[PDB]
Design a binder for this molecule. Structure first.
Ligand SMILES: [Cl-]
Ligand SMILES: [Cl-]
Ligand SMILES: [Cl-]
Ligand SMILES: [Cl-]
Ligand SMILES: [Cl-]
Ligand SMILES: [Cl-]
Ligand SMILES: [Fe+3]
Ligand SMILES: [Fe+3]
Ligand SMILES: [Fe+3]
Ligand SMILES: [Fe+3]
Lengths: 200, 238, 200, 238, 200, 238, 200
């Protein structure tokens, strides 16, 4: 059959990933421009939200060296690929877990609705790629919202998860933090309540 | 109007099938017995039709829809795609590629086909496509079934799709047949085997192309075509 | 020595060619635009002629499933490559033999004279390519005109046929069919009176 | 009533696919994590149903006719035949062979199959046959099409026909899948590749069988089945 | 050493097993004679019992597409191999789990006691073979009865299970369903309470 | 009467010698130039004579005694024996095997053979035998000598015995020639070499069979014959 | 694919074929029982006929060393396989061409009608196998009769011959010889009027 060039194989990001990708968190000086955890300036359109979560291994223990990259639509359900720290909104960002609490945060707006390739609406979601020492190839997941229950029930991506109980693992829990809408999204890499991870 | 401005690499008529190939019975009485007469290339041979402005319908390249009588054809959904290049490896843009084939059961929609496998009411069997500016064409179809035929007493065509390609001149025009990777009928066919070189036979075998498949939808096969090399004239009439 | 990529090898067009290449003939519905046997609209310059012929195998029997492709200059001896069914004239056409009579027909103009690569005028001619079940690679030939004896006598392509007797196999016979100028061009694939076939 | 009078060669569970074969995703949660418990063979294991007196309809082995809704199914007409023997090479007479498959387009006639290739109104997909006194069975059917499925993101079953064979005891009962010679999907399938030994995979590939074909009618494939070797008890309770 | 012909290797029965092996279940028309879940006609000797159960994967979720084959002695502890739908009793049957509830049912008699090859009585049991999507080779098990504690305690096959706790996974739970004697036999393919599976 | 209840594996006409094999000169003018016309098998083709009740003389298989004119023939006393099977390996019992050959000097007892080697007054050179219930036949004869013939200017047939075998039908009936292990005339013979495939030629070479020899009396050669495979009709006119 | 034992390859019957297969014609003594050219004793049922023919090579010259085997139905259209010289009728016979005139004869009855495998009636015919020096594998043909013109026109075997002119080559010409119905069937192995030969 047809064989193409083989893809360069993945390797773990490693414990020192913060050196190249999370300069502050490593303990090192930052350059003038950094890809980080603020996708929205205060002036961006949409509902402003705080996201937070922790990451657990198969023993129930915090992953304190993990690195997350996210990709989401703006409030209109459009992806903004022209990355610029002058933008009020960027669709892409990066965050990491603190070596102390093991908690990551992101400052963004709630994404609007995007259709799948067949034109069926997907519930509002943030695409997540998880990297860390011990993780040989990054894990893809989605963060959906518990105040979108009715949209989530019709999502054609959520519905590809065969067991309804596993879908729960993708639903962030809404709260309030210092007067701002916030959601917690914890990730369990392995075991009881293991978070659904995607291949695409 | 067309100009004489190019020459085409001479055919290797030991690479192509010879005229007389007796296991393919119909060739016995339809092969010339005199040698072909070689003639130099002139404007008559080195030009040919350009079909850019022929009017193509929206589904001319899509056999899943170009014979719609209220359903989808039955059988294995496939994309057949590839590139038309010449022997120098140069792409052949905006060229006419045509194709025709039996349905999933090996039944041809032709009055003289009386094979007992049924016709398919949503399948015609014909497509056409102009190559794009980089030499690429593609069709969507159903994979044809093998077809028995009255040659030897138990002869069966491998699954195949007939192809016609115009190229830049009547010198390059070619009719051929595509076959499918791994088909064990291929080495047994006296039409395939009209080609004496096994490496020539390989050039007619489409490869399963997973990378071009639509998941949950259709597979795909890759069939590239090589037409005669085209070069500039040089050192003529001096 | 230098080896290029090999040409894709020829195969027979097979008995059902018409279905891909001559849709009417197969018993098939045609599309809106088809490449067929009318090279000249009634208003084209030059002398309007009907061409017809039959095709014989080596046992003298009609080849009823043959398919011909033709390429010719317009009355002014220019090749019209921009194929378009709106054109007064196209240099290219296709025809085929009926499953009964075994006769093909073309509606065209007499081609004007064209020079070879050395500047030597060739007699008026139609380039023909013949396809059929049992023909593994198509046969090239030329159709010249019996009312162009002077030109035929001087054609640098006809003069490449060593035996004079064989030249006559390429000379179409003038008649009238219902008051219109016609020429018959029969082809004998094999044996007595075998038509000259070309390689180029 | 049945008697304990025979023993069956122990299975090689490294020849068969293992329970856990993660590329075949559904096997991850449906494979035991504890070792199987070996038990000696008794009358419970060494006997099984004989189906000689089950009432078979006239077309139970013929899929071209067992789902007749006023026509022939579309697709490649084939005989699927072979012999059922045990590991000693002994024929397995009067045994139940059952089979099921998709239509020509890879569509299964099952409510949970929502693949967009259409159903065929004259094709059901099920057959059964008792082996004759020499171990032979045969079916007539249409060659099934490949079927995409929700495993990896672009996974396709090779054309396959499922088989169930009872044999002389519940110890010999087997479900398997037949594949077809040369199918380039075979080495890419995580169900095929649940089998670790490539020589085991070869035992599942039916061979094109020209000698068994009906000319102008149908091709044929040969698929022989080997069930566990049956021997007499010897030197028991002494 | 001596090598025989290798056994044809197993493959999964796949999700559409029912269409070849359980025609009603697929949404399919049945044939005149089918191998199904009624082992005893109302007039068979012995105690008439309803058997039922559900099947669980390693995440605790119902296996709705499983298929079971059963083999058991009649009330007199004899194996009836001459399968025939006219028979008062057949020792063989097939059942499957519904695509909703996930429950299978068998209508049979309690099997009488059968001796092993050494002459040692085994507790009354039904031999089960379990097939499904994701099961590459079928799983062998036994269904024993919680009202046969004395016999179970002495079974030479149950006593081959090293851990006593695991023996309990093979003991069906007696109840009544609409006034008829029933037993529930749940199977857990994987994890907590994993059912004992046999090799022989 | 005979019945049409069997089919015979179609002949491989590139395994057999082709008609036109110009080095064997007589084949030039005695070979058809038209394609053979394939016809399906009917009762006309799939039946044929059975010679069970032909009356055989006690010496019909024994060329040492069936031309007795006062003595034994001169030459190497040999048994020629073998089995007649079909392509499935099935014995062909009660079938007619006929043979004829030159004497020890390569002279045929035929008015048209004027070769200068003398006739043997106790050798005729014709035998016949019906195969037994297991497909076995045997002849006792003299090993024939090579034979010059007017083909090329110095052509010699290898030592050979002509065989005619009826089999179960006119479709299986075969005439061939036996050659002898190690004869270096074999690769030089344009009749032998009418067969293109050297593996086919090997099938015509009888092997020295010491196990079948009579000590102090005669040697033995083994020559097994494979006729076209016979099977039952299946799925015909349905 | 499936490969069987290969068939023993054919070889020419050779010029001396008469030694083993036509004992008289060789010039040698006959055994008490010989397979020869009388398929019918005077008492056989049906129309008694004489058949004769000559065999020509590609140069128009007689083949004087040819050997023919024939197979035909009795007058009822039934094949009689139990060969016996005590029978009034045998379906099988053998004949050869004289080294002098080059003519073979057969004494038989006209065969009745036989259906093909699809139940369509074949015109009355005799199956012929031709053997000779220079013939590497025997040639199969059929002898049909010119007093069966209407049956011949519907024969499904004759109709497999694509050209009507080639069918003529299979039609024996009726005459009278010494007061008996006779037909001539000449065979032309090669060239002008080449006899149709079959593969089956
Ligand atoms: Cl759901
Ligand atoms: Cl390429
Ligand atoms: Cl085997
Ligand atoms: Cl005697
Ligand atoms: Cl015997
Ligand atoms: Cl006709
Ligand atoms: Fe590192
Ligand atoms: Fe074709
Ligand atoms: Fe399947
Ligand atoms: Fe000889």
């Amino acid at each position: 059959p047809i064989e193409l060039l083989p893809e360069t194989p993945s390797q773990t990001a490693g414990p020192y990933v913060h050196i190249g990708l999370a300069l502050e968190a490593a303990g090192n000086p930052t350059r003038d421009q950094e890809i980080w955890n603020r996708l929205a300036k205060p002036d961006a359109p949409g509902e402003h939200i705080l996201l937070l979560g922790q990451v657990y291994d198969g023993n129930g223990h915090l992953v304190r060296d993990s690195f997350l990259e996210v990709w989401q639509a703006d409030a209109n359900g459009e992806y903004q690929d022209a990355y610029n720290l002058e933008n009020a909104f960027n669709s892409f960002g990066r965050t990491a877990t603190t070596f102390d609490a093991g908690e990551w945060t992101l400052h963004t707006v709630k994404p609007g609705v995007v259709n799948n390739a067949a034109g069926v609406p997907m519930a509002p979601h943030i695409n997540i790629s998880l990297f860390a020492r011990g993780i040989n190839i990054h894990l893809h997941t989605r963060l959906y919202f518990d105040d979108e229950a009715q949209a989530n029930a019709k999502c054609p991506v959520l519905n590809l998860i065969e067991q309804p109980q596993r879908r729960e693992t993708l639903i962030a829990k809404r709260c309030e933090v210092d007067g701002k809408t916030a959601y917690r999204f914890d990730i369990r890499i392995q075991g009881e309540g293991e978070t659904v991870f995607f291949d695409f | 109007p067309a100009q004489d401005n190019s020459r085409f690499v001479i055919r290797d008529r030991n690479w192509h099938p010879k005229a007389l190939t007796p296991d393919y019975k119909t060739s016995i009485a339809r092969s010339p017995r005199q040698a072909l007469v070689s003639i130099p290339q002139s404007i008559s041979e080195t030009t040919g039709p350009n079909f850019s402005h022929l009017g193509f319908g929206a589904h001319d390249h899509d056999l899943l829809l170009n014979f719609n009588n209220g359903g989808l054809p039955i059988g294995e959904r496939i994309i057949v795609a590839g590139r038309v290049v010449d022997q120098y490896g140069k792409p052949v843009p905006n060229t006419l590629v045509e194709m025709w084939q039996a349905n999933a059961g090996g039944r041809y929609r032709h009055k003289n086909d009386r094979y007992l496998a049924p016709l398919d009411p949503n399948f015609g069997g014909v497509g056409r496509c102009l190559t794009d500016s980089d030499g690429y064409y593609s069709f969507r179809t159903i994979k044809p079934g093998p077809h028995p035929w009255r040659n030897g007493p138990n002869d069966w065509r491998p699954a195949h799709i007939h192809f016609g390609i115009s190229g830049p001149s009547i010198a390059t025009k070619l009719i051929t047949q595509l076959y499918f990777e791994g088909d064990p009928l291929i080495p047994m066919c006296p039409i395939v085997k009209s080609i004496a070189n096994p490496e020539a036979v390989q050039q007619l075998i489409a490869k399963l192309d997973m990378n071009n498949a639509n998941p949950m939808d259709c597979l795909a096969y890759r069939f590239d075509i090589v037409l005669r090399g085209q070069r500039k004239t040089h050192f003529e009439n001096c």
